[PDB]
Amino acid sequence: MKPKVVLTHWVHPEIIELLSASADVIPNTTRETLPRSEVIARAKDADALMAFMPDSIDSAFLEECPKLRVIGAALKGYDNFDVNACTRHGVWLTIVPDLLTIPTAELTIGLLLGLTRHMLEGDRQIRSGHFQGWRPTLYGSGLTGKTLGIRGMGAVGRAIAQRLAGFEMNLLYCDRIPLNAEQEKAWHVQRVTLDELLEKCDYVVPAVPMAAETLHLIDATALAKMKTGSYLINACRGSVVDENAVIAALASGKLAGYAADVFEMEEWIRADRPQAIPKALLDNTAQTFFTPHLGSAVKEVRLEIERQAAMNIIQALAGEKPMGAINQPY
Amino acid sequence: MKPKVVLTHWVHPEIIELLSASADVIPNTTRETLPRSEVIARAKDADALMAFMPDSIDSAFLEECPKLRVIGAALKGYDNFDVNACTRHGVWLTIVPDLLTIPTAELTIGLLLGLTRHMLEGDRQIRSGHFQGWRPTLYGSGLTGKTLGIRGMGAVGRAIAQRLAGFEMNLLYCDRIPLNAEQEKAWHVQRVTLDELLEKCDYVVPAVPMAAETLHLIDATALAKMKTGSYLINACRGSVVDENAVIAALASGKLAGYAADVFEMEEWIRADRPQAIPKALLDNTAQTFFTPHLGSAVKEVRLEIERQAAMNIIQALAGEKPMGAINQPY
Numbered sequence: 325m326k327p328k329v330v331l332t333h334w335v336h337p338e339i340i341e342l343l344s345a346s347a348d349v350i351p352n353t354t355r356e357t358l359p360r361s362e363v364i365a366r367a368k369d370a371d372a373l374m375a376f377m378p379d380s381i382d383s384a385f386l387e388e389c390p391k392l393r394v395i396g397a398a399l400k401g402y403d404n405f406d407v408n409a410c411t412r413h414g415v416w417l418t419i420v421p422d423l424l425t426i427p428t429a430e431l432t433i434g435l436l437l438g439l440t441r442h443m444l445e446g447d448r449q450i451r452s453g454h455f456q457g458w459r460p461t462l463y464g465s466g467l468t469g470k471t472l473g474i475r476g477m478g479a480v481g482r483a484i485a486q487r488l489a490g491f492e493m494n495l496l497y498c499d500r501i502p503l504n505a506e507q508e509k510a511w512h513v514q515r516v517t518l519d520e521l522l523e524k525c526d527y528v529v530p531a532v533p534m535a536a537e538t539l540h541l542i543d544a545t546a547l548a549k550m551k552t553g554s555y556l557i558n559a560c561r562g563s564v565v566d567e568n569a570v571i572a573a574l575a576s577g578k579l580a581g582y583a584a585d586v587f588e589m590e591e592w593i594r595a596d597r598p599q600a601i602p603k604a605l606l607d608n609t610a611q612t613f614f615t616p617h618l619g620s621a622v623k624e625v626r627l628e629i630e631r632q633a634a635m636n637i638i639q640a641l642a643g644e645k646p647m648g649a650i651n652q653p654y
Numbered sequence: 655m656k657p658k659v660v661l662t663h664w665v666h667p668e669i670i671e672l673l674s675a676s677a678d679v680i681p682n683t684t685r686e687t688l689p690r691s692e693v694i695a696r697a698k699d700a701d702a703l704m705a706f707m708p709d710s711i712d713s714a715f716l717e718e719c720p721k722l723r724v725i726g727a728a729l730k731g732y733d734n735f736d737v738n739a740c741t742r743h744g745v746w747l748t749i750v751p752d753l754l755t756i757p758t759a760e761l762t763i764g765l766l767l768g769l770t771r772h773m774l775e776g777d778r779q780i781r782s783g784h785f786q787g788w789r790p791t792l793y794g795s796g797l798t799g800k801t802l803g804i805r806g807m808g809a810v811g812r813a814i815a816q817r818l819a820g821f822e823m824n825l826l827y828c829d830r831i832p833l834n835a836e837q838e839k840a841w842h843v844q845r846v847t848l849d850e851l852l853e854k855c856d857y858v859v860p861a862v863p864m865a866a867e868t869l870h871l872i873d874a875t876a877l878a879k880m881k882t883g884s885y886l887i888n889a890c891r892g893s894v895v896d897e898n899a900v901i902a903a904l905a906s907g908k909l910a911g912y913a914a915d916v917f918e919m920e921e922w923i924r925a926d927r928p929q930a931i932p933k934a935l936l937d938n939t940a941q942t943f944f945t946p947h948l949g950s951a952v953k954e955v956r957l958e959i960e961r962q963a964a965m966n967i968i969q970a971l972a973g974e975k976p977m978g979a980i981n982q983p984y
């Protein structure tokens with residue numbers, strides 16, 4: 325009797341209980357992305373699907389699941405979705421507002437601190453048991469007094485600036501669209517060009533989306549005209565920074581270190597691609613700091629993203645117009 | 655006939671060339687602590703000595719070094735120098751100002767973020783090659799909205815608070831001395847007691863020293879009263895945290911994590927001392943973030959500490975009362 329909702333990725337147990345009131349829930353009890361064949365097989369008679377970023381909902385998917393009334397994306401975008409095929413197929417598609425900006429600003433500040441202060445190699449040096457007290461090693465660079473440029477004064481770029489206010493730094497920013505007056509002084513930031521930002525900075529933090537336009541914006545050329553011994557911190561998307569241009573600038577001492585939350589291997593919509601992170605980056609524990617796309621891996625934030633995709637599903641199955649709907653099925 | 659100066663630990667070449675104008679310098683070319691015997695054999699006919707945290711200057715030391723006119727310590731205190739012995743033997747003793755504050759406050763925040771966002775464990779999974787793009791794992795804890803608590807508002811607790819101003823947290827503070835009206839508002843921190851701040855807090859950060867009073871101030875009794883699943887960040891001095899009471903707090907789920915830059919193991923001035931950090935903490939990679947007393951391991955700060963040790967030596971060797979003198983011998 326109950327509609328069925330298939331969840332393709334693990335969710336908190338409260339959201340499954342929330343969904344059970346009006347649907348029978350087929351969760352993914354693993355922390356693993358199931359293969360597209362196993363997802364389609366589960367969704368085939370499902371009234372609803374909660375979709376995550378591995379899911380690519382095309383007409384092929386939708387024709388394998390003719391009972392689909394709603395796809396509730398736990399995503400802020402719809403790139404991997406055929407919005408009009410969902411419309412043609414009488415399938416509400418819903419999305420959730422951006423709850424990822426603060427957890428990604430916070431993490432970006434984490435990568436900056438961990439990498440400029442050698443915190444990983446310092447943690448390894450404690451695990452090894454050889455610690456006998458302070459030594460004149462792992463000397464890093466400080467924050468106060470330094471110049472850090474934000475390439476991309478967006479949502480993330482903003483919250484970063486707001487969160488470095490107390491750090492007595494000198495913040496620059498290179499963006500296509502400038503900012504107003506009040507914010508530019510509120511969070512003491514200054515506008516400047518890419519060749520000038522990139523040349524006059526100690527730490528470079530790109531916050532631009534991935535486009536057909538700006539890809540490898542940080543390439544061999546960009547890296548060459550920065551301050552020697554600078555630091556590159558990349559929590560935007562993978563293919564914006566040339567992981568091989570930094571393999572060389574690492575060995576040549578041009579930049580002091582690279583921290584990353586993303587990798588070009590992480591982009592399947594891209595037709596250029598190595599299936600692994602460069603092995604020379606993965607062996608350079610002394611100048612690199614890496615997280616596996618953990619920008620929004622905060623329990624509270626994921627709970628709320630999940631909550632909203634679940635509400636979208638409960639509204640659509642109830643006959644209501646769902647709040648995240650970006651679509652009008654007939 | 656140039657006076658001789660022994661430096662017990664590595665210093666930047668800039669400092670050596672500085673001291674080379676007025677003395678012959680015997681440096682520690684490595685990043686290691688020479689043993690005492692070796693320090694003594696180098697300093698046995700030294701006119702000056704630059705001392706660091708491992709050094710411990712007692713009467714036996716001085717009686718082995720008779721030409722000694724000055725000990726210029728690259729430290730802000732003198733707990734391991736028999737000052738009056740120095741006076742008695744005709745040797746100046748100098749220290750440097752406290753310049754450790756801001757680099758310590760920044761590293762504390764680094765320790766907070768890295769622990770709560772599982773970045774150590776994130777890096778390992780990256781270096782394991784098994785990374786395959788986003789997954790629903792390594793969900794950590796956010797800052798915004800959470801309540802963090804600074805036990806003691808000295809210089810470093812101010813710097814920590816001032817820096818966290820832009821992170822949308824709820825900050826409390828408990829020092830026995832109060833803070834003035836307006837700085838307490840630009841940082842949005844609030845007066846409360848030890849019993850209060852421990853009850854209401856997800857993050858606890860001690861920022862008081864050890865003395866006779868205040869050691870194992872974070873003990874079983876304190877850990878009995880905090881929040882379940884809370885975090886302890888200890889980058890002020892060691893032994894203010896009862897490490898083994900923290901080893902229980904983790905196991906009983908009372909603490910979700912412990913990060914520290916300082917240990918109990920770092921104190922030979924207490925009749926309670928094995929030889930290491932307990933390896934129940936060293937094996938706990940998933941709940942602990944550690945660093946080897948990197949509180950002030952930034953280049954610009956180490957350099958300037960070395961320069962003031964250097965200047966103090968030059969001054970005394972030239973017959974001047976050295977600016978950092980904590981004594982007056984004859």
Ligand SMILES: NC(=O)c1ccc[n+]([C@H]2O[C@@H](COP(=O)(O)OP(=O)(O)OC[C@@H]3O[C@H](n4ccc(N)nc4=O)[C@H](O)[C@@H]3O)[C@@H](O)[C@H]2O)c1
Nearest residue numbers: 424428476477478479480481500531532533559560561619
């Ligand atoms: N690691 C994560 O987990 C994570 C978390 C959240 C989001 N993301 C993803 O979404 C982006 C974040 O940035 P954003 O602040 O969320 O997005 P936006 O406001 O559009 O960005 C600023 C923009 O830059 C523009 N621009 C400027 C010049 C130019 N030639 N082309 C441009 O395109 C223009 O000015 C605009 O302000 C990337 O991080 C990406 O990886 C990842």
